[PDB]
Design a protein around this ligand. Structure first.
Ligand SMILES: C=CCNC(=O)[C@H](Cc1ccc(O)cc1)NC(C)=O
Ligand SMILES: [Cl-]
Length: 130
């Protein structure tokens, strides 16, 4: 129905605003664009499902997220990919892990404060009806 289309459109506006706030944070610049295979040829071989915030915006605009849970699965991937690719004790790897955990924690904290639980439940119910 048009009302369900309206619901998904509101979800996309909400997710674009959360993603823009993460992308303009200086700590998260490394996560804003895909890893360049030139610098990092082993990346695409270790990480089977690369994810970054520009990919997330593209997904929003392709109507790939129909619930905030689906979006948070991709934010979790940005985090877990960085934990897996950069697991060493050296400071460059620790800095990327800390920035990835902080992204993820920031996204969840904005959603806890600003997503109405009944809106998420509505999205879940429309998704499940498809
Ligand atoms: C799970 C998300 C966060 N990751 C982190 O804790 C990172 C890196 C780290 C990870 C394990 C260590 O034993 C020591 C450092 N930042 C810190 C705590 O400086
Ligand atoms: Cl830096």
């Amino acid at each position: 129905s048009m009302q369900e289309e309206d619901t998904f459109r509101e979800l996309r506006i909400f997710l674009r605003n959360v993603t823009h706030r993460l992308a303009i944070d200086k700590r998260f610049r490394v996560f804003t664009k895909p890893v360049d295979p030139d610098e990092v040829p082993d990346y695409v071989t270790v990480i089977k499902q690369p994810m970054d915030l520009s990919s997330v915006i593209s997904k929003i605009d392709l109507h790939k997220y129909l619930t905030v849970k689906d979006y948070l699965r991709d934010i979790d991937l940005i985090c877990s990919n960085a934990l897996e690719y950069n697991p060493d004790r050296d400071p460059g790897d620790r800095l990327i892990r800390h920035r990835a955990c902080a992204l993820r924690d920031t996204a969840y904290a904005i959603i806890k404060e600003e997503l109405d639980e009944d809106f998420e439940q509505l999205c879940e119910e429309i998704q499940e009806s498809r």
